[PDB]
Amino acid sequence: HMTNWLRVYYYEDTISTIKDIAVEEDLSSTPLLKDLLELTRREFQREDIALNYRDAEGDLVRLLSDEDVALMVRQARGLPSQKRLFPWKLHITQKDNYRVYNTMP
Amino acid sequence: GSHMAYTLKVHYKYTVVMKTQPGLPYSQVRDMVSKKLELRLEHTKLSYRPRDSNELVPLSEDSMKDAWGQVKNYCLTLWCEN
């Protein structure tokens, strides 16, 4: 069985649920932001969202451009298991849900 | 210059991360944060945490060098008011 799977965290307020999404593209590869947005629309049927990743310090970081996406993939701490999972995981939030960000000094 | 890669992490209503050169002047740091957050320059009000403080202090031309002294693991963290 040869499906590649992107695991995504889908947030309702500060708790997420997990959904694994079939992706044709190579496990090694770097998507464009616009393609991740179209993937999230097909799977969750909304466009009022932001995409994010969690950095090495534990802070959630909003993706705003293709270059941010490339940083996410580059930092990716995933070990290849036999599960065919992308090594980075996508965090999806309501665009006005600011409670998920560690912005407090 | 340095062989390492530095970032600016900025906490606005949301958090962003961008590549930076270490030691940039305030004018350029403000400008890059303003562009990243799609904010008018004049509405881009940044602060940093000084050595061993719980309190933030305003970022400015004058305090920029001190701010760069607070880099941790190749990252300078700033806060953007609002």
Side-chain angles (χ1 to χ4, degrees), chain A residues 16 53 68 72 103:
Chain A
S16 71
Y53 65 101
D68 294 354
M72 166 185 68
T103 57

Side-chain angles (χ1 to χ4, degrees), chain A residues 55 57 59-62 64-65 67-68 71 98 101-105, chain B residues 7 9 11-17 19 36 49 54 56 75 77 79:
Chain A
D55 73 9
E57 293 201 287
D59 293 339
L60 197 73
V61 176
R62 180 176 294 200
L64 301 179
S65 74
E67 166 167 291
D68 294 354
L71 192 38
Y98 301 124
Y101 297 110
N102 181 28
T103 57
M104 195 203 53
Chain B
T7 56
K9 161 142 74 193
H11 294 299
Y12 178 47
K13 296 189 291 159
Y14 51 89
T15 295
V16 299
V17 171
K19 294 197 233 174
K36 190 73 168 177
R49 177 191 289 93
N54 294 339
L56 305 181
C75 177
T77 300
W79 286 262

Side-chain angles (χ1 to χ4, degrees), chain A residues 7-49:
Chain A
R7 177 156 288 201
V8 314
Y9 296 117
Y10 179 70
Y11 290 74
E12 239 142 52
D13 193 40
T14 57
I15 288 162
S16 71
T17 60
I18 298 161
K19 174 167 225 209
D20 287 325
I21 296 166
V23 178
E24 310 176 71
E25 282 71 40
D26 202 81
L27 283 179
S28 82
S29 72
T30 305
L32 302 182
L33 179 55
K34 191 183 154 149
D35 292 329
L36 290 177
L37 286 165
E38 77 178 54
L39 170 148
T40 50
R41 190 193 73 125
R42 186 70 181 183
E43 290 295 328
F44 298 90
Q45 310 183 301
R46 37 204 305 177
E47 298 154 294
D48 67 323
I49 49 87

